[PDB]
Every structure is written in structure tokens, then in C-alpha cells.
Amino acid sequence: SGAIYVGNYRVVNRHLATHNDWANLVWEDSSRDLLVSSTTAQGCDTIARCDCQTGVYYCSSRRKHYPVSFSKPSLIFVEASEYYPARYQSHLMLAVGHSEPGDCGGILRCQHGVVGIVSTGGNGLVGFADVRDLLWLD
Numbered sequence: 001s002g003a004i005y006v007g008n009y010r011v012v013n014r015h016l017a018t019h020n021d022w023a024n025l026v027w028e029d030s031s032r033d034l035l036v037s038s039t040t041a042q043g044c045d046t047i048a049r050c051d052c053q054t055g056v057y058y059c060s061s062r063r064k065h066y067p068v069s070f071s072k073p074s075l076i077f078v079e080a081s082e083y084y085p086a087r088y089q090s091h092l093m094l095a096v097g098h099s100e101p102g103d104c105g106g107i108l109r110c111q112h113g114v115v116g117i118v119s120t121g122g123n124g125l126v127g128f129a130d131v132r133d134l135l136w137l138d
């Protein structure tokens, strides 16, 4: 689990969105596994506006922050999962790293702030759903 709080926005994994994220839906993209919902409180996270391909992500299944090289946001295939069918995820950044069910929502961050969150895992790979293109969060 885990979420981004910038301005009046909560960003989550779509597949982990609560009944309240949907009651207050701002934007969802099934293909990217993202949902943004509205908040009452203001958020203190900076969103990274950069083309960084190195940063740190938190891995709840190790209670550890891992530094990673990750791919440019792309249209990369994700297989089964109890949450989705066989489908290409867009704005997806893979890195070599540990990602289990429950590691989704873990924040990847560079010097410029939040690059995105964990959305995919397996095969020794960790998919982060990118949020740097979502300028409207600022």
C-alpha cells in the first residue's frame, strides 16, 4: 500500500483505490494503474519534473529503501495478477529489484521529488507507474 499527497490530491494504485478514492475521483487511467482522488487537507510531497532514471524506492516487503536504475516510462506487458488481465501498462518504468503483492504504493523518488509508485513486480523486476507527466497535480 501507500499513496502520494501533493496539493489537494491523493494518488494511488487504481487496483488499491478505496470506495472513498472513487467517491472523490479526480482522474483514473486503468492502463497506467493510477487513480487520483480529491482531499480536504493539502499535501507536502513535491512531484519530480525531470528525466531522471536513478532514484530510491521503498520496498515494504524488506522495510528497505533500494536505489535503482529504471526504464523510461513505456508501454510494457504485465501478465496475470489477481487485480488485472493480460494487458500492456503505459507510463511504466521497470528496474531490477524486489516487488511482491503488497509493495504497490511504495514511492520511487529522485532528487527532484516523487517519480512514481510501485505498480508491478515479479521476475526480479519492479514496475513503477510514472506521475512526472501529470503537471496538473501542481
Ligand SMILES: COc1cc(Br)ccc1CC(=O)O
Residues within 6 Å of the ligand: 081, 082, 083, 099, 100, 101, 102, 103, 104, 118, 119, 120, 121, 122
Ligand atoms: C507489486 O505488486 C504485485 C506484484 C506481483 Br508479483 C503481483 C501482483 C502485484 C500487485 C499487488 O498485489 O498490488
Ligand SMILES: [Zn+2]
Residues within 6 Å of the ligand: 048, 049, 050, 051, 052, 110, 111, 112, 113
Ligand atoms: Zn529527478
